[PDB]
Amino acid sequence: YRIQKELHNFLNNPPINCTLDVHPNNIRIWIVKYVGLENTIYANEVYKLKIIFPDDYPLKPPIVYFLQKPPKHTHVYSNGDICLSLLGDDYNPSLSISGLVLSIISMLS
């Protein structure tokens, strides 16, 4: 139910330079494509973010990581995992997925 609300929000208000795909056989998995913003070190490079909604979503945060190859960044591990407080300790269950992705893009930029 909350996933459908987020889907509307994301499609209607997608983060800058992002487009959405969803898994055809799993309503709980999204793949976000980000094209690196001009005037940042990732300009024109394509990165893909996998988003998994756990069974306890939204009280439990979505799991979010970059597909291979991930952007080279201090807060992105070789396996694409992301070190970001909003996804962990500072998670608020009212966070929109669109805003989560925009915060990642901000972190990268």
Q: Mind listing the domains of the chain with CATH numbers?
A: 1-109 (3.10.110.10)
CA distances to 9, 31, 40, 59, 104 from 47, in Å: 21, 10, 14, 27, 12
Method: X-ray
To what resolution in angstroms was this structure determined? 1.9
Q: Which amino acid is at 17?
A: N
**83 is known as an active-site residue:** yes
* Sheet (strand 29-35) strand order: 18-22, 29-35, 46-52, 63-66
Cis peptide before 60 (omega within 30 of 0): no
Report phi then psi at 50, rounded to 5: -95, 135
Q: Please pick, among 75, 83, 90, 93, the residue that the annotation labels catalytic.
A: 83
CA 51 to chain centroid, in Å, comes to 6
